Coordinates of C-alpha atoms and ligand atoms in Angstrom, one line a residue:
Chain A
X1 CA -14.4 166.0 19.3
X2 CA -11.1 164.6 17.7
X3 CA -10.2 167.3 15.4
X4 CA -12.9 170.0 16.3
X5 CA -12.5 173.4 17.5
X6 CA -14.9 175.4 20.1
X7 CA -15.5 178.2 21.4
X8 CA -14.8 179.1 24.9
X9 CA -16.6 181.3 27.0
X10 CA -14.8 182.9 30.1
X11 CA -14.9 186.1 32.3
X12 CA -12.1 187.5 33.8
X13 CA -12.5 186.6 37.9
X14 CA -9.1 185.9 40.2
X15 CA -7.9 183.1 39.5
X16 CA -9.9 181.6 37.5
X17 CA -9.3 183.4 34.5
X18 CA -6.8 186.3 34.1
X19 CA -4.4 188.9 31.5
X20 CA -1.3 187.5 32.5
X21 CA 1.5 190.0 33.6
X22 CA 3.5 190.7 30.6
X23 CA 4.0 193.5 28.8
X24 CA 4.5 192.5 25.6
X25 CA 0.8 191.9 24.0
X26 CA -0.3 188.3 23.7
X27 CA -2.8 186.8 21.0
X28 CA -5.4 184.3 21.1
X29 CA -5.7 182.0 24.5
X30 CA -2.1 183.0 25.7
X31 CA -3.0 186.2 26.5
X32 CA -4.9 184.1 29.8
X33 CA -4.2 182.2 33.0
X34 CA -5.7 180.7 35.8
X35 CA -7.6 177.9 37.0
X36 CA -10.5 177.4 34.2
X37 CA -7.7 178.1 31.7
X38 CA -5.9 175.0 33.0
X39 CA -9.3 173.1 33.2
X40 CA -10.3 173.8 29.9
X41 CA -6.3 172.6 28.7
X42 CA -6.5 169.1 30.3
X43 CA -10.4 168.8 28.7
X44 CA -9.0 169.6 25.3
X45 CA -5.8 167.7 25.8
X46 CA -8.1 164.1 26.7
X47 CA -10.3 164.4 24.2
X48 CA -8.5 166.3 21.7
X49 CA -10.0 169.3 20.6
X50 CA -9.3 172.7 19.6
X51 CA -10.5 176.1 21.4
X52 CA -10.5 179.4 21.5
X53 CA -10.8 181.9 24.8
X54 CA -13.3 184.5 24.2
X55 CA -14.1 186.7 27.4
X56 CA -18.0 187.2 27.1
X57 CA -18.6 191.1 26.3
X58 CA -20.8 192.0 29.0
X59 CA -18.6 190.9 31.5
X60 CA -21.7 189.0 33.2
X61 CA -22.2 185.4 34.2
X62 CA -25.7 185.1 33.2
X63 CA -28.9 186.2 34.9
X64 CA -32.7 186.1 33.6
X65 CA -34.9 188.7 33.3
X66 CA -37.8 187.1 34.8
X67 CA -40.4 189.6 32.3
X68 CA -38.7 189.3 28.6
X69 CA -37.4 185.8 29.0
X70 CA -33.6 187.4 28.1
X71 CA -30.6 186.1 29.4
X72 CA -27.3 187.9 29.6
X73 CA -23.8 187.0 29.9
X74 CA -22.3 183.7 29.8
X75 CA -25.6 182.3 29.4
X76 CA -27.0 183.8 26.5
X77 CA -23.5 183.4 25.1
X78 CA -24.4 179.7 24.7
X79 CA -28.0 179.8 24.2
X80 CA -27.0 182.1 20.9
X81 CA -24.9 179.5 19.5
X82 CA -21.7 181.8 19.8
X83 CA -19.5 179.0 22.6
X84 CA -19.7 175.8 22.9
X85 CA -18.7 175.9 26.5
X86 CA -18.8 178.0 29.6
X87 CA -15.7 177.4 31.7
X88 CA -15.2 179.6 35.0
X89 CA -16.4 180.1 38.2
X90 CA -20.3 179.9 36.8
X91 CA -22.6 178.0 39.3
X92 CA -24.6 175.9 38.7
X93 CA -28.6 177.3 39.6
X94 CA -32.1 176.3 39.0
X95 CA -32.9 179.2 36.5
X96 CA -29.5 178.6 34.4
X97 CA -30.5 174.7 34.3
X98 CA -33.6 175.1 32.8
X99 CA -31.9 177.2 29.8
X100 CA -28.9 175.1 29.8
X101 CA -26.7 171.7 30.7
X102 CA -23.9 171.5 33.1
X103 CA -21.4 169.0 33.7
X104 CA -20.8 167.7 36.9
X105 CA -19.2 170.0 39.0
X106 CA -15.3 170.3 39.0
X107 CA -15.4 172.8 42.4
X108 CA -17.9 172.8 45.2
X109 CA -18.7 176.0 47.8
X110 CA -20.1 178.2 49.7
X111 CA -21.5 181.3 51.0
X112 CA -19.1 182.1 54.2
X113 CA -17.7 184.9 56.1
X114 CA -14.6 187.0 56.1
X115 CA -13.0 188.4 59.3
X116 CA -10.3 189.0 61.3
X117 CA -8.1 186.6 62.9
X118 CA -8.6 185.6 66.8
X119 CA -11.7 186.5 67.4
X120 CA -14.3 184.9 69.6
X121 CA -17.0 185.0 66.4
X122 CA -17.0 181.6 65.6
X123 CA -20.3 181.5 63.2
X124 CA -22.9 183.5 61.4
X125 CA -25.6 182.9 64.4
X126 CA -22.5 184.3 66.5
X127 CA -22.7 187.7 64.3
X128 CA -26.5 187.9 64.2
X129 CA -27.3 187.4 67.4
X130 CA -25.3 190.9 68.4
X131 CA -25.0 194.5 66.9
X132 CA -21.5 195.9 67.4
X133 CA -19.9 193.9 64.2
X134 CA -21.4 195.0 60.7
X135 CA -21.3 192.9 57.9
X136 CA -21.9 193.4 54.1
X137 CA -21.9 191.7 50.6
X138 CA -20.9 192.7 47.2
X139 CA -23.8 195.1 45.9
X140 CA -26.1 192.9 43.7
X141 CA -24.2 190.0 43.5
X142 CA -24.1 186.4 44.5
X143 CA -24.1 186.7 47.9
X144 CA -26.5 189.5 48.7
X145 CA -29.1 187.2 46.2
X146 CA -28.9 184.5 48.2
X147 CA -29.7 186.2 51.6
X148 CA -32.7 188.5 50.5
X149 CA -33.6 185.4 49.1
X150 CA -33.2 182.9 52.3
X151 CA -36.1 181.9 54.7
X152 CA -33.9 180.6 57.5
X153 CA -34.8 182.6 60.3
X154 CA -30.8 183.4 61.1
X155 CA -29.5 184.8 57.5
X156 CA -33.4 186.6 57.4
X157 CA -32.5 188.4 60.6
X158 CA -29.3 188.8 58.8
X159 CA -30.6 190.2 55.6
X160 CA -32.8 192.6 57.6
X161 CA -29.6 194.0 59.6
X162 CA -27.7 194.0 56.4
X163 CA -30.4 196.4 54.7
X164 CA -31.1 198.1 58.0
X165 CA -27.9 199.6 58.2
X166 CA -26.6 203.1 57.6
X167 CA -23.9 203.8 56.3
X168 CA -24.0 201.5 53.6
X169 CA -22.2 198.2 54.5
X170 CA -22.6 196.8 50.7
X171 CA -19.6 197.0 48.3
X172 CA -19.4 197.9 44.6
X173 CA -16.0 195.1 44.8
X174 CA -15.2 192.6 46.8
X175 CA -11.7 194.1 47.1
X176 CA -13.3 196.8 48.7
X177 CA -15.1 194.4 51.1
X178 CA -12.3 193.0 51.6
X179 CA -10.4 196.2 52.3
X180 CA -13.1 197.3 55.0
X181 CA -12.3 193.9 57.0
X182 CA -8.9 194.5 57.0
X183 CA -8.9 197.8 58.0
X184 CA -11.8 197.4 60.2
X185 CA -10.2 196.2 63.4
X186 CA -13.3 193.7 64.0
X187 CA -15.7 196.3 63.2
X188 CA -16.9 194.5 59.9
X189 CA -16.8 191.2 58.3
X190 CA -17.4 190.2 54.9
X191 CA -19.8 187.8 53.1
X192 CA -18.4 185.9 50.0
X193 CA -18.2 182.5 48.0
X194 CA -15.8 180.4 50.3
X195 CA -13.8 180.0 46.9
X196 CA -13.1 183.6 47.4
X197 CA -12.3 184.0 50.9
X198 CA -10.0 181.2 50.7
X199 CA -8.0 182.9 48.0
X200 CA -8.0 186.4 50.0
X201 CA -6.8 184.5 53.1
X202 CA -4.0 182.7 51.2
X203 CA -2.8 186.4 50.6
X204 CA -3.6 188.0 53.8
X205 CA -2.8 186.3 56.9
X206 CA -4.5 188.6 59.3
X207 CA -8.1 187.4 57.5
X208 CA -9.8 184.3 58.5
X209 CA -12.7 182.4 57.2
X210 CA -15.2 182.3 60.3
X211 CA -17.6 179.3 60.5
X212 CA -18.6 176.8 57.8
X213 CA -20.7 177.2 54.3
X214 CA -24.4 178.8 54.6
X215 CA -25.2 177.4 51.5
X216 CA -24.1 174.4 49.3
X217 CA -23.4 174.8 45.5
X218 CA -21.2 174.1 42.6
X219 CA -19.3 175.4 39.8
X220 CA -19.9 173.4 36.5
X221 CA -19.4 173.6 32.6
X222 CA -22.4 174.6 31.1
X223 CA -22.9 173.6 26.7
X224 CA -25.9 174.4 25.1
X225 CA -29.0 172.0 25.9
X226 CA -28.4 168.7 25.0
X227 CA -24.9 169.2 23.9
X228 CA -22.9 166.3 22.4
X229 CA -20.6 166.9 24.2
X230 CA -21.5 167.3 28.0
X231 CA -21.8 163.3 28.6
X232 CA -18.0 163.1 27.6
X233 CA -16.3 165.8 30.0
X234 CA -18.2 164.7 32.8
X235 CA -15.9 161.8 32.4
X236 CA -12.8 163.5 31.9
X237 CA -14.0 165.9 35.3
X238 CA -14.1 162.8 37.5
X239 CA -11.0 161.2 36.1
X240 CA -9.3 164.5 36.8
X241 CA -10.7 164.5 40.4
X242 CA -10.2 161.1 41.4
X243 CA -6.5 161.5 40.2
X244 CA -5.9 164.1 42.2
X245 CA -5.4 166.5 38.8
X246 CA -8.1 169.6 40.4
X247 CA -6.7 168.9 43.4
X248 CA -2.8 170.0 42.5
X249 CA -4.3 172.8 39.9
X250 CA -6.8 174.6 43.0
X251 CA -3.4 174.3 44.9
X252 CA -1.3 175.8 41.8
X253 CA -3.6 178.9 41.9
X254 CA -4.4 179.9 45.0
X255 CA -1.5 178.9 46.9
X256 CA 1.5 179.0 44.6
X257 CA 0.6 181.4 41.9
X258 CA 0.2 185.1 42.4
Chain B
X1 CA -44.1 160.7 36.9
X2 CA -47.9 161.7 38.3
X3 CA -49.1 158.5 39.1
X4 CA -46.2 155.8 39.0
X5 CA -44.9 153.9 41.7
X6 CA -41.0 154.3 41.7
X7 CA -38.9 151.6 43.4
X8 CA -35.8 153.2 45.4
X9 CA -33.0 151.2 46.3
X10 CA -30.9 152.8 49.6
X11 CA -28.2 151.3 52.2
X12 CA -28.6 152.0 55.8
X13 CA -25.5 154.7 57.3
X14 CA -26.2 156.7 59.5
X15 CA -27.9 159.5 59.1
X16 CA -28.9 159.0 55.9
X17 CA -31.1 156.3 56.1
X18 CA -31.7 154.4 59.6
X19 CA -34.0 151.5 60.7
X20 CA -36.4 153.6 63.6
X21 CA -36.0 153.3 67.4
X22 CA -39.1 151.5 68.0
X23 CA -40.2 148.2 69.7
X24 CA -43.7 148.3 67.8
X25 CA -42.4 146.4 64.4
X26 CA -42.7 148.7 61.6
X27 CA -43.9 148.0 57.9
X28 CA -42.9 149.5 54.2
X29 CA -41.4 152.8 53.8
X30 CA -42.2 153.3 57.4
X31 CA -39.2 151.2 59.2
X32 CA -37.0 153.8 58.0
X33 CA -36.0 156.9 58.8
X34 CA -33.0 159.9 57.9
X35 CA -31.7 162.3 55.8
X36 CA -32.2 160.0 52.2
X37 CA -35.5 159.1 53.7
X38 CA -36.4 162.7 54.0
X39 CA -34.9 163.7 50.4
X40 CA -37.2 161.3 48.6
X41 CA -39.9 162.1 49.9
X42 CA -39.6 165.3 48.8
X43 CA -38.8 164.6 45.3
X44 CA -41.9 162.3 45.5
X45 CA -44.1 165.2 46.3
X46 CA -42.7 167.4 43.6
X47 CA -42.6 165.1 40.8
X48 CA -45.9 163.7 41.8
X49 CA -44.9 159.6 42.0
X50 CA -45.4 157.5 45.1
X51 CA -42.2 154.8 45.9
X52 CA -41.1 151.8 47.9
X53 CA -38.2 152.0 49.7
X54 CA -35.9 148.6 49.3
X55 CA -32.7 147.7 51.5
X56 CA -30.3 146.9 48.6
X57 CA -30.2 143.1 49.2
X58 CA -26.5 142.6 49.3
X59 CA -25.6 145.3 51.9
X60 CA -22.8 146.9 48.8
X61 CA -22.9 150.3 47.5
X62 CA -21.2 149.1 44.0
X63 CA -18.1 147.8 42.7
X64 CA -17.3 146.3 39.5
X65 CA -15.6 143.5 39.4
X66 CA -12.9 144.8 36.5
X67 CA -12.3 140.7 35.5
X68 CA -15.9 139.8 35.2
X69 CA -17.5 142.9 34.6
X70 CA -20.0 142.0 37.1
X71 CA -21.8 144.9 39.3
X72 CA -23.2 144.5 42.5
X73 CA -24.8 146.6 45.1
X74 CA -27.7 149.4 44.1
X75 CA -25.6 149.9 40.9
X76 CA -26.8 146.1 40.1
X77 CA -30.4 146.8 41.4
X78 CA -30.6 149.7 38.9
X79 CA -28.8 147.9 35.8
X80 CA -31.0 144.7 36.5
X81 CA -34.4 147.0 36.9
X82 CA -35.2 146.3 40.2
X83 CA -35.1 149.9 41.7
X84 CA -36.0 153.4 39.7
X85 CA -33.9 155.6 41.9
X86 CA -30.8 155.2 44.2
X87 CA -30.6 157.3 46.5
X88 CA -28.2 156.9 49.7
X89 CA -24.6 158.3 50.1
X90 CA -23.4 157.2 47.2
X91 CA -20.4 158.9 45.5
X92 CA -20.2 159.7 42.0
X93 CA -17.4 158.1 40.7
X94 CA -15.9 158.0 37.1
X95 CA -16.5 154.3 37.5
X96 CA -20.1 154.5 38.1
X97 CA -20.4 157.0 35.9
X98 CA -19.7 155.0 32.6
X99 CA -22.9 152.1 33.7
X100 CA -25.3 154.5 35.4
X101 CA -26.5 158.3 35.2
X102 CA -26.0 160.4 38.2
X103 CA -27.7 163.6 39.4
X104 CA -26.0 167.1 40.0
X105 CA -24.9 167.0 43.5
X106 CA -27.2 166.9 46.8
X107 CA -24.2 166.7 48.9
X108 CA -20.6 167.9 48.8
X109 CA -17.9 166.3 51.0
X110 CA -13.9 165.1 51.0
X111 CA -11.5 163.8 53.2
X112 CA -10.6 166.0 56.5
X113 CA -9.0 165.2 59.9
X114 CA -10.5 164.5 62.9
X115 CA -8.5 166.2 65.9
X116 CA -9.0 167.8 69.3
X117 CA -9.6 171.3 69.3
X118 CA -6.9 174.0 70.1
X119 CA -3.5 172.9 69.0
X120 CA -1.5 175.1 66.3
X121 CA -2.3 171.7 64.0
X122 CA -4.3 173.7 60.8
X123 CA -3.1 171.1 58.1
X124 CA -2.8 167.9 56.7
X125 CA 0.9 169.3 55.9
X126 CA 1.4 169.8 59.6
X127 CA 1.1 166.4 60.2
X128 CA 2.8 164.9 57.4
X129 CA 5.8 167.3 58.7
X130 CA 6.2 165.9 62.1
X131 CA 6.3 162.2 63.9
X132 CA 4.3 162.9 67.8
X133 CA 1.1 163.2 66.2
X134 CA -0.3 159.8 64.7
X135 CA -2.8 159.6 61.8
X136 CA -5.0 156.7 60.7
X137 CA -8.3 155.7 58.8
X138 CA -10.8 153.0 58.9
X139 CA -9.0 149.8 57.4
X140 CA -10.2 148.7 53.9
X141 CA -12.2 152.1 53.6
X142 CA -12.0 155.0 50.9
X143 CA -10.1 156.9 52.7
X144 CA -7.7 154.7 53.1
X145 CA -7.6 153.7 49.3
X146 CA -7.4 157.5 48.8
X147 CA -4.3 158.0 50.6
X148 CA -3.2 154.4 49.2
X149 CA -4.0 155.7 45.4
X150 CA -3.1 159.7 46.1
X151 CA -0.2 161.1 43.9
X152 CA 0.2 164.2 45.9
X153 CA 3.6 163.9 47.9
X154 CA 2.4 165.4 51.1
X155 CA -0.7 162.2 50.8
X156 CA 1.9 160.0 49.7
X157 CA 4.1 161.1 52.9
X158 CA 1.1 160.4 55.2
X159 CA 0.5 157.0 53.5
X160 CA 4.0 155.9 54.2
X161 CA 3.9 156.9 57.4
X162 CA 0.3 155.2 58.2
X163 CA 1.4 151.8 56.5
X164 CA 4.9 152.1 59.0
X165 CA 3.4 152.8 62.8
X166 CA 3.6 150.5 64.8
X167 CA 1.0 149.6 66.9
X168 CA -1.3 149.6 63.5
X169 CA -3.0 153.4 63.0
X170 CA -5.9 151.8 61.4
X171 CA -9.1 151.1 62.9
X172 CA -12.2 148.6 62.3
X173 CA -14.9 150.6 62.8
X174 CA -15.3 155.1 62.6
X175 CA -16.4 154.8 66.0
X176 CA -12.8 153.5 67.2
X177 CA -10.9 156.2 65.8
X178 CA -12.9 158.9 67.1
X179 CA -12.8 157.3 70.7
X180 CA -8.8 157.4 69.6
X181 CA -8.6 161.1 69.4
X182 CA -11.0 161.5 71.9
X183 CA -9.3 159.5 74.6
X184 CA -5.8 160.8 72.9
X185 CA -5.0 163.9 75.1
X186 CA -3.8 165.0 71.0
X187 CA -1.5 162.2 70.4
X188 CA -3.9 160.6 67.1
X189 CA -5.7 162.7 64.7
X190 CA -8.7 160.1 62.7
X191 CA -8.8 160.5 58.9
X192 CA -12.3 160.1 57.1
X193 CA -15.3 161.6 55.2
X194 CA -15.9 165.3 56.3
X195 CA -19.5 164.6 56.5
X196 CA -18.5 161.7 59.3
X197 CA -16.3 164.3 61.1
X198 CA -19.2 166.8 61.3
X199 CA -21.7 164.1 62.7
X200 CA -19.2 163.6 65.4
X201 CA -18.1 167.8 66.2
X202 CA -21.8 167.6 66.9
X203 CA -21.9 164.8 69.3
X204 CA -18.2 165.4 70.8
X205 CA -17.8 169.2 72.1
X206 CA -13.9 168.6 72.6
X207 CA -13.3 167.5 69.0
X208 CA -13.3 169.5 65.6
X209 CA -12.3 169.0 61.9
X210 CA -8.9 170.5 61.3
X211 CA -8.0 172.3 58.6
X212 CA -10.6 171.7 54.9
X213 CA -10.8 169.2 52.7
X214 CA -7.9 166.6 50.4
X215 CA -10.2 165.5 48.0
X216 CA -13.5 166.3 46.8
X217 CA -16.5 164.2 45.9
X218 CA -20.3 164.4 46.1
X219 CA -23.2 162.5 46.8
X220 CA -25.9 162.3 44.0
X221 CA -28.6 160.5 42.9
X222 CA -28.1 157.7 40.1
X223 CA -30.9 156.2 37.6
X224 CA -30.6 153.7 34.7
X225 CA -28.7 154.9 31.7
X226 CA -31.0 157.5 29.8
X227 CA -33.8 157.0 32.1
X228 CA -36.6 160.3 32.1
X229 CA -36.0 160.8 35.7
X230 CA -32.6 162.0 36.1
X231 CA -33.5 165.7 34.1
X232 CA -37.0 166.1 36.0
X233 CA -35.1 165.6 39.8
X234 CA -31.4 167.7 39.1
X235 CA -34.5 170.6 38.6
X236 CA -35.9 169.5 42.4
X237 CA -32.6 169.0 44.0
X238 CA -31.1 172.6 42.6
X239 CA -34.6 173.9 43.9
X240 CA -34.8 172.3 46.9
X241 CA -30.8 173.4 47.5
X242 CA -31.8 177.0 46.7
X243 CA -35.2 177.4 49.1
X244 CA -33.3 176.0 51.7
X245 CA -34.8 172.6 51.9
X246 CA -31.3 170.8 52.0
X247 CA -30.2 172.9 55.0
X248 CA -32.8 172.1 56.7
X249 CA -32.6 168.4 56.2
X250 CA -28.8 169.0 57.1
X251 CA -29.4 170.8 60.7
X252 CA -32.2 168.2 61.3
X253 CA -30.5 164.6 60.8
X254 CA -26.2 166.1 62.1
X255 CA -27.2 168.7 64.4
X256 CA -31.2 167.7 65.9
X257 CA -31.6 164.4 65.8
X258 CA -29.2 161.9 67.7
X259 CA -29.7 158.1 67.1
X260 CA -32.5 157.1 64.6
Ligands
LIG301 N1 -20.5 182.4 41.0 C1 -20.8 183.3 39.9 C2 -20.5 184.8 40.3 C3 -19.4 185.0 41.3 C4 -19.7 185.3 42.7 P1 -19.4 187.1 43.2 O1 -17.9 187.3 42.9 O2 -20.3 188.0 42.4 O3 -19.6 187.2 44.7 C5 -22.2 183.1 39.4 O4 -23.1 183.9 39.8 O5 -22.5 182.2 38.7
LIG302 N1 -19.8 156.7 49.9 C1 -20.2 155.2 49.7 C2 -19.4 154.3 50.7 C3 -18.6 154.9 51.9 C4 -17.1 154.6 51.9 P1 -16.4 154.5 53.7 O1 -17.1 155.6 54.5 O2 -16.7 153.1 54.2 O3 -14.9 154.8 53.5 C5 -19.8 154.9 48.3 O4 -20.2 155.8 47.4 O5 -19.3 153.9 47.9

């Protein structure tokens, strides 16, 4: 890796990777910011390689399609040779790990819920258990997956309300999910990654995460199968944890930078 | 794996593995029971292997002795190919890392406090920022070597001030500092693992974890260097994660379940 350069695959997503806010144009990897930017910085700088930023063109993380064996986004990105690495907020999933390696993970998460602040809600089994609050998800994303997909009786119920519903209570971004629990007076809460909801929260101190995580998973690097390369930034991932390095740089980005 | 016999090497801690509340003695496998009990036997049944569960015989999760170079614990019993598998909570640490290959994650945890419920207290900052409240950790635990080892001022603050109180803020046991917030109408707030804080919010109705998490870590499993088994069960513990399985284990052994 001394003396190499790789390709680096990204999506823009707040704050892990983003334009920064300057009007005079910027080339190569200073045109970006954020969290995986930084990651991606201290990997290169203690092992000493070379990189280059390329957003992925579809603007997808990577999903199969379960008939034609294809792979989009991220995913394919590596499995076509084009990036060495995959460095955002990517989780790490059964289908992606039979196509491809992942590091350890440098972030861990959750689904939760967004909601207004001072509330009696306290927990999912709090919302599903009653009628008056709607909630919602991002329309085909993460989130929505993981509850059509769940077989615990509470987020099933949940699910069932969730499609049940009319008008629609499914968002085409989470800034618009976001929008409807701010401006819905208690009337709606939102269901994200915790990652996310902690980062909308930090800017909006009438929202609230409610409860804990419904789910348990991880954002990793994913390389090509059997990469050279994996074995030797899982190292440099738990160095950077233990000394506190992901720590300060979570804290950099969603509490300091805006 | 179909057909093998696969020795795993574990640690009791509650809840993950626990000797069984009965008078009748108990024999194998069978004097054990808990959340790592429960987790191997569903890798077993996926991957098609039968296993013997062995107490790691020197009660240690693993160290190395930086001098000698000498490991202990179930690191040793995997190095010295006495167990297969170990599977307990055992952090994944840079250190073990370098002898031993871990699995992704089954578990994700990290530091938290320990409080009573309903005070304005929503941070480790708001207690490094003020003197009524007092803060400690188990003595000679990792939490304490985190706050010890921490580089972040507001940790390095709150180590300062542990180290300084007077009477000591450090207990010998988890169980002492909870029954020190407990019994503390809010006057000590009990550092430690957030997956020991949630064991006791389910036990203890007037306590909760305040505020999220100062470091991160995880649980996995760890194998011998190279060994076939580590690619095969990352596959089971993402699936297992994904159907459910691991919540369910979760809400049975912290929220169901009270001794074991
Ligand atoms: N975690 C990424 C997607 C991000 C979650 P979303 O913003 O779609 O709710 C993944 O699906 O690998
Ligand atoms: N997590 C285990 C040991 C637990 C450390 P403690 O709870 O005694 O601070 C390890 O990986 O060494």
């Amino acid at each position: 890796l001394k003396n190499k350069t790789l390709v680096v695959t990204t999506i823009l997503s707040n704050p892990y990777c983003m334009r920064k806010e300057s009007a005079i144009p910027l080339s190569g990897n200073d045109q970006f910011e954020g969290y995986a930017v930084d990651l991606i910085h201290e990997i290169s700088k203690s092992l000493g390689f070379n990189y280059k930023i390329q957003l992925v063109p579809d603007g997808s993380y990577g999903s199969l399609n379960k008939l034609t064996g294809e792979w989009n986004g991220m995913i394919r990105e590596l499995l076509e040779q084009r990036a060495d690495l995959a460095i955002a907020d990517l989780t790490i999933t059964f289908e992606r790990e039979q196509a491809v390696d992942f590091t350890t993970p440098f972030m861990n998460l959750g689904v939760s819920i967004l909601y207004r602040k001072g509330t009696p809600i306290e927990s999912a089994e709090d919302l599903a258990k009653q009628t008056r609050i709607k909630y919602g998800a991002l329309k085909g994303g993460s989130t929505a997956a993981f509850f059509r997909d769940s077989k615990i009786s509470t987020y099933q119920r949940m699910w069932s309300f969730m499609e049940s519903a009319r008008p629609s209570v499914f968002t085409a971004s989470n800034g618009e999910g976001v929008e409807r629990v701010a401006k819905g007076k208690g009337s709606y809460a939102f269901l994200m990654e915790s990652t996310s909801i902690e980062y909308v929260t930090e800017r909006n101190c009438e929202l609230t995460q409610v409860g804990g995580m419904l789910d348990t998973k991880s954002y990793g690097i994913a390389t090509p199968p059997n990469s050279p390369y994996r074995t030797a930034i899982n190292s440099v991932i738990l160095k950077l944890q233990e000394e506190g390095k992901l720590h300060i740089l979570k804290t950099k980005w969603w509490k300091e930078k805006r």
